[PDB]
Design a protein around this nucleic acid. Structure first.
Ligand code: NA
Length: 90
DNA sequence: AATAAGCGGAAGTGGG
DNA sequence: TCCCACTTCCGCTTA
């Protein structure tokens, strides 16, 4: 199965959910979720994973925070904003 | 209060 | 056995 950070990066590259997620500064790898339309993207993640329960943004962000230590994705001090590592962006 | 983003400990699930 | 890579649950903090 695909990893969560790669799912998000693939979405950003494809543009398929441009109303739910977008680059802020793509050169820096910063991206931001829509306040109003992030749940639809969370739902798609859970369906892609085949999880038992409906995926929510809160649970998706709970997974995102676990990348903070290893570095793939870090929270930016801006609303609903995160940053991919250079390694992830290669 | 209502609404929302953010946090993480702890326990459960997947697939090695 | 026991880690991977989250998922699920719960309670809390800040704005
Ligand atoms: Na929120």
């Amino acid at each position: 199965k695909i990893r969560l950070y790669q799912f998000l990066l693939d979405l950003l590259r494809s543009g398929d959910m441009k109303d739910s997620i977008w680059w802020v500064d793509k050169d820096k790898g910063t991206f931001q979720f829509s306040s109003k339309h992030k749940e639809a993207l969370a739902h798609r993640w859970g369906i892609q994973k085949g999880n038992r329960k409906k995926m929510t943004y809160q649970k998706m962000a709970r997974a995102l925070r676990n990348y903070g230590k290893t570095g793939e994705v870090k929270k930016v001090k801006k609303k609903l904003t995160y940053q991919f590592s250079g390694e992830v962006l290669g």
